[PDB]
Structure formats: structure tokens, C-alpha cells
């Protein structure tokens, strides 16, 4: 029973292989009481309950582990509290973003092999695992998580490393931007405890405008675009034109000051770096995944933007599975349960003789 | 002769443009007995009988009834000049609610009917006074503290940080420590005395651990201050404890970073190619910054965070209290600035929304 753990920059999904849904999901936040039998560090859902006191801090930033002391805590919590299984008899599978520092995946292998004593291990790209869930074999995978947005084109299972594009703008950066334009209306959120309140607003009310220029003028006059949200303290706030500005930073990163292009242009550039003969199949098999692409109507906008750049003869098909929030984990369940995959596990003996560097030679 | 008016969170400055010093400075306090209302120097003199109330809190006008009183008092009691002939160059802190600045344009264009108007960021005007063009601005005034990095005149909006630690918060913190020595204060008139103790006895220590141990070992740092009734009080470690709350906000209970870290985080939000220029042209302004030795401590703390090869030069002119107004006088007297004035005709065509599009 191979575990499948996807330790993303946002919430981490953990569960057994061969199933259809994650066993346990919880935010990847570790917090400690502010200022001065409460335990020192609250992790997982426990930090969310007492978020008004603890100093919430994300151990993973932009898909890179910044504090290796914190990542040992979350993994210790997942294996011994949520799944309640001993890691000393089951293999463990991990997911990591592409174009990551080599020191990132080297330390992950060191920790579990030495501390958790996992007999086997494999590290796979998050975008590649997303293509398993849909059952497809080709088509680019636009994966946009909390901190990492990458597009990895795949044709017939032969990935194209030179066409992989990574953009740091992602869901978490939108949370900061929405907090910035909320002070424009009159509501101020500063502490990291209040950030989770903003993230709740973005999940429920925030959406993507099909024609962005026409929306400002229409929303200026009538209040048909105004929705009212209830704060946990009992206050009721009303947000109007800010509903569509927050996700438009995905398509126009100039609002945040970044020089990089939007997700629609990043996807277009990724396909262009590929050869002409495979552009036939990449246009008609575009796949979305991750929580940042869960906005109501983002699929419709992406199809229109790409069609303008792409030739009118070509067909742009944006595949939007309804479970794209857990697409990364679901695809990894199939990989661990496949009989062919059983020959690619990094056994203990191979790591013992080759050191931590073995993870570079036996994983993509 | 534009009437530059800086309606700050207390001690509002006003005077004719083209000069070098404010014509009149008076507290931005409106108090009523517990005439009908008193504003300015008459309020402070009679502060014992009145209940002092600040119309402006954290750079946001919380009550427009009182704001009209001080503004009427400025043009008709201090400057003694009608505003029907000259424009007004207002100042407003960055990252403010749009309802705050929209009313400011509307109120004068309807009540006072000034020929023109303009609203300028308080951090930008500070750089004008020094004559520089690059380098972040630390406009740690009363109520709010904001850093607006500028490089070659192109202000970067994504790096504009706003912090709520300022002199008013320090006055409340100086309230709590003083009570530990028996010097308690209750009424708002008493609080004005505590601001006095902060203005003449508070100083930023170069380091806690050496000074805190020294303060608890001898009495060389004792200072004797007489409160306006006549009795004298002696304060000890409170001299260097309240000012340092700017750098360690954990004392106040607020989670935000300190003054040094806010500057440090603001620079990294800028591009790498311009960080070198900003590090060597840091500018300071505001009444809170007027603490003795704040530049020396900020020089050390930023140097520890910044790379060793980097050079830190914290520029701070001696007259940094009126830096915003002095920069505002230069802008109003510029020949090129006469085109950016908001005309009376432009207000009525677009209503109060002209402030957003033109400023």
C-alpha cells in the first residue's frame, strides 16, 4: 500500500493509493502562540481553529521548502495522526514542481530515508501526475497551485523539457493583491491571521470576467455585481468591482508589477517552443489543474484568449475536469498502483551506496 | 500663490507657496466643553476643560464635521486670506480609502470654491524638499508610517508599504510603562502631557541588552521632568523603551515588522538593479523620526540585514519635521506643475471622481 503525499505550497493531500479521493487533507500551516497545556507548535487543521492567536507561517513558499525544521513536523503529523500508519513498511511517493532547486529534492530523500525509515521512494513532477488522472496521454498541463504555476507539454508520454515554463505568480500572490485592493474600498487586513479570512473571500465570491473592459463600466453604475460576505466576527462587508480584478492578475500580471506575461500567454509560449508537427495535438488537448484554476468561468476566458493568438483554423479545447482541485493526487494514485511502476522505486540499498544524489538519476 | 495645506494627524501646517517655513502650525484637535467648539492653540490652552478629539485618525478622516472646522479655521483665522483666489495643494498618505480623498476634493470645491486643487502623496513631497530623486522615503508621521521607494521619478506602487505604528501608538505605549512607576494618567488632557515627556526625554538606544542591564545597575540615565502642575517626576528605562517599539512592535502586541524590517522588505519588492541605489539614498521624515539617534540605530540594524558589501547612508536633514510641507512648497511653485491643476470646470463634468483620474 504505497502512500501518495502531495506536499504542495498550499494544502497538502495525503492518502493511500488505489483509491479515488485523498484520505486526509489539511492546510500546510504551522503556527505558534503570539508574543507570550498548550503545545509550542500547532500544525494542520489545529492551527486553523486557533488562527486568531498563533502566528501562522507557511513552511513551503513558491514550491520551495524554506524551513526544513517545519517540514519534518507536517510529515510527522500526516503519518502518525491523520493516516495513523507506520511508514516503516509502506513506500512513499512525493510530488514536486518542475525547475526546482536541486537542493530541494535532495533533502526530502535524506529525511524520510533516515528519519521515517521508508523502504522505498519516488519523486514525480506534479504536472505529469495530473495527466494520469484525466486518462489522457498528450496535451499540455497548465498546473497552477498556491505558489507555482507551470505548463509542462507532453506528447505521447515523451515530455519536452525545453518547452517547460514556470511562473511564480499563483494563488497565494492573488491573496496578497486582493488584500491590497480591499484597503481601497475601506477594509484593512494586515496580520497573517486575517489573511485566511481573505482567502475565504477569494474562494467563494471571486470570479473571472469574460470581457474585462466592459465589466468596469457596467459595475460602476449598477450594484448587480455587489455581493455581501459575513466576517467571522459578525461584521458584514460588501465587495463590488474587486470581485473580478483579483483573478485578472492571472492574465495581466502588470497589476502586481511583474514583467512576466499572463497564464494565457505563458501557455501560448510553451506550445510555440514545441515543434510544428505536435502543435496539432497540443491545441486540442489543453488540460487545467490546481486550485488556482477553480474560479467560475476561468475556462471560458482562457479559451477566448488563446484563440485570438492561435490561428482561427486551429481549434482550442480547454479540458476542464470537475475534480481538477485534486487532479495531482488522483493521478499519483494510478502511478503507485501500476505494475510497471514497481521497478522504479528507489530502494534503500541504492540510496545507501549512491548517497542522496540517487534521486537525480532515478526521477524526472 | 498656492495655499499648501498639510492636514496631518495633528500639527497641521499651512502657508503660502514659495517660502521655506510654514506660516502657521497648530494641533489638529477639535474639543468641546463637557463658544461651542474650539480648534487650534485656543483648544490646547483650555485643554483641561474640553474633551480633545482628533478629527484625523491613522491618516483617515473619521468625521467630516470636524474637518471642515479646522479647514475653515486655517484660511480665516491663521492665514487670514480668502481661498477664492488661490489653489490648494493637499497632502494624503498612500494606500488610503478612496472615500477619504474623494470627499476632500468635493468639500472645498463646493464649500470654499477654490479655483484649483491637487492631492499629493506625502512621501513623494519629502523627496522634493531634499532635492533628490532616488531613494526610499520613510514618512513615519503620526498615525501612519509608509515607505514609498522612488527611482528616477518612477514611483513603484507594488513596493509601497504602509505600517500603523507611529507616534500615537507610542504615546499609548508610553502610557503603560509610566504607570509601572506610579505616574498614571486618565483624561485626554493628561495624555497631551505624556506627549510632552516623549518629545523631550525619549531617545533611541543603540542596543537593549547593554542599556537595559546598565539602566538596572545605576541611575546615571535618570531625568527629572516637572508635570505642568508643578510636581516633578523621574523616568528611567522608559526613555529608551517607548521609542524602540518602532523597531520591536511585539511590545505593543501588533504582529507587523519594525521600522528597519519594513524598509528592508520594501527594497526587495523592488527590482535587483535598483536596490543598490536605494540602499545609499534612504530618506527620513516625520515627527516620530525626530527621535535622537534614530538614524544611528537604523544604520546598524539595516546593515546587519543587508549584505556587508552594500553601503548604507541614512540621509536625514536637521529640519526633517517640516520636510513634507517644504517639498510641497517647491512643487506648487514649479512652472511645469501649472498644467496638472484640477480646474473648477473639470470637477463638475466628472463629479468627485476627478481626484482618482488626475492624481
Amino acid at each position: 500500500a504505497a502512500l501518495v503525499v502531495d506536499n504542495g505550497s498550499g494544502m497538502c493531500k495525503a492518502g493511500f493509493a488505489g483509491d479515488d479521493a485523498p484520505r486526509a487533507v489539511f492546510p500546510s500551516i504551522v503556527g505558534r502562540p503570539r508574543h507570550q497545556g498548550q503545545k509550542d507548535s500547532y500544525v494542520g487543521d489545529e492551527a486553523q481553529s486557533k488562527r486568531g492567536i498563533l502566528t501562522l507561517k507557511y513552511p513551503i513558499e513558491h514550491g520551495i521548502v524554506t524551513n526544513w525544521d517545519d517540514m519534518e513536523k507536517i510529515w510527522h503529523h500526516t503519518f502518525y495522526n491523520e493516516l495513523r500508519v507506520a511508514p516503516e513498511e509502506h513506500p512513499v511517493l512525493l510530488t514536486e514542481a518542475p525547475l526546482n532547486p536541486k537542493a530541494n529534492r535532495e533533502k526530502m530523500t535524506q529525511i524520510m530515508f533516515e528519519t521515517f525509515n521508508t523502504p522505498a521512494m519516488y519523486v514525480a513532477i506534479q504536472a505529469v501526475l495530473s495527466l494520469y488522472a484525466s486518462g489522457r496521454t498528450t496535451g499540455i498541463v497548465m498546473d497552477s497551485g498556491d505558489g507555482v504555476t507551470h505548463t509542462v507539454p507532453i506528447y505521447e508520454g515523451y515530455a519536452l523539457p525545453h518547452a517547460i515554463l514556470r511562473l511564480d505568480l499563483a494563488g497565494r500572490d492573488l491573496t496578497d493583491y486582493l488584500m491590497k485592493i480591499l484597503t481601497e474600498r475601506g477594509y484593512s487586513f494586515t496580520t497573517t491571521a486575517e489573511r485566511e479570512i481573505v482567502r475565504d473571500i477569494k474562494e467563494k465570491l471571486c470570479y473571472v470576467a469574460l470581457d474585462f473592459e466592459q465589466e468596469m463600466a457596467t459595475a460602476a453604475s449598477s450594484s448587480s455585481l455587489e455581493k455581501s460576505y459575513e466576517l467571522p466576527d459578525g461584521q458584514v462587508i460588501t465587495i463590488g468591482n474587486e470581485r473580478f480584478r483579483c483573478p485578472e492578475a492571472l492574465f495581466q500580471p502588470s497589476f502586481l508589477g511583474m514583467e512576466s506575461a499572463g497564464i494565457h500567454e505563458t501557455t501560448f509560449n510553451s506550445i510555440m517552443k514545441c515543434d510544428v508537427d505536435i502543435r496539432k495535438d497540443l491545441y486540442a488537448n489543453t488540460v487545467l489543474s490546481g486550485g488556482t484554476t477553480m474560479y467560475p468561468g476561468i475556462a471560458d476566458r482562457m479559451q477566448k484568449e488563446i484563440t485570438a493568438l492561435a490561428p482561427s483554423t486551429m481549434k482550442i479545447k480547454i479540458i476542464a475536469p470537475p475534480e481538477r482541485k485534486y487532479s495531482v493526487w488522483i493521478g499519483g494514485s494510478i502511478l503507485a498502483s501500476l505494475s510497471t511502476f514497481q521497478q522504479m522505486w528507489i530502494s534503500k540499498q541504492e540510496y545507501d551506496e549512491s548517497g542522496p544524489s540517487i534521486v537525480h538519476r532515478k526521477c524526472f | 500663490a498656492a495655499l499648501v495645506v498639510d492636514n496631518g494627524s495633528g500639527m497641521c501646517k499651512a502657508g503660502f507657496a514659495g517660502d521655506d517655513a510654514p506660516r502657521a502650525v497648530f494641533p489638529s484637535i477639535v474639543g468641546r466643553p463637557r463658544k461651542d467648539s474650539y480648534v487650534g492653540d485656543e483648544a490646547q490652552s483650555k485643554r483641561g476643560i474640553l474633551t480633545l478629539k482628533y478629527p484625523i485618525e491613522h491618516g483617515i478622516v473619521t468625521n467630516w464635521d470636524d474637518m471642515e472646522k479646522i479647514w475653515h479655521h486655517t484660511f480665516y483665522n491663521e492665514l487670514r486670506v480668502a481661498p477664492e483666489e488661490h489653489p490648494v495643494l493637499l497632502t494624503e498618505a498612500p494606500l488610503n480609502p478612496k472615500a477619504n480623498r474623494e470627499k476632500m476634493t468635493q468639500i472645498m470645491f463646493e464649500t470654499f470654491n477654490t479655483p484649483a486643487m491637487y492631492v499629493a502623496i506625502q512621501a513623494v513631497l519629502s523627496l522634493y524638499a531634499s532635492g533628490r530623486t532616488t531613494g526610499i522615503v520613510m514618512d513615519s508621521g503620526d498615525g501612519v508610517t509608509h515607505t514609498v521607494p522612488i527611482y528616477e521619478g518612477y514611483a513603484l506602487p507594488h513596493a509601497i508599504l504602509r505600517l500603523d505604528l507611529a507616534g500615537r501608538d507610542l504615546t499609548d505605549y508610553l502610557m503603560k510603562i509610566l504607570t509601572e512607576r506610579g505616574y498614571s494618567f486618565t483624561t485626554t488632557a493628561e495624555r497631551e502631557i505624556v506627549r510632552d515627556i516623549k518629545e523631550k526625554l525619549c531617545y533611541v538606544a543603540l542596543d537593549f541588552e547593554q542599556e537595559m542591564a546598565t539602566a538596572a545597575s545605576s541611575s546615571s540615565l535618570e531625568k527629572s521632568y516637572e508635570l505642568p502642575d508643578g510636581q516633578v517626576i523621574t523616568i528611567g528605562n522608559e526613555r529608551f523603551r517607548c521609542p524602540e517599539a518602532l523597531f520591536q512592535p511585539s511590545f505593543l502586541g501588533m504582529e507587523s515588522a519594525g521600522i528597519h524590517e519594513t524598509t528592508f522588505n520594501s527594497i526587495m519588492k523592488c527590482d535587483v538593479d535598483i536596490r543598490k541605489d536605494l540602499y545609499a539614498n534612504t530618506v527620513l521624515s516625520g515627527g516620530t523620526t525626530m527621535y535622537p539617534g534614530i538614524a544611528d540605530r537604523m544604520q546598524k540594524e539595516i546593515t546587519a540585514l543587508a549584505p556587508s558589501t552594500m553601503k548604507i547612508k541614512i540621509i536625514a536633514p536637521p529640519e526633517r519635521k517640516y520636510s513634507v510641507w517644504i517639498g510641497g512648497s517647491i512643487l506648487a511653485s514649479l512652472s511645469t506643475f501649472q498644467q496638472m491643476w484640477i480646474s473648477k470646470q473639470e470637477y463638475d463634468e466628472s463629479g468627485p471622481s476627478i481626484v482618482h483620474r488626475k492624481c
Binding site: 477594509y187 487586513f189 462587508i237 | 483617515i60
Partner: peptide
Amino acid sequence: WXAXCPA
């Protein structure tokens, strides 16, 4: 302010 802080 309205939602958050006092002002």
C-alpha cells in the same frame, strides 16, 4: 477603518 482596526 470599517472592517479591521478602529478608523
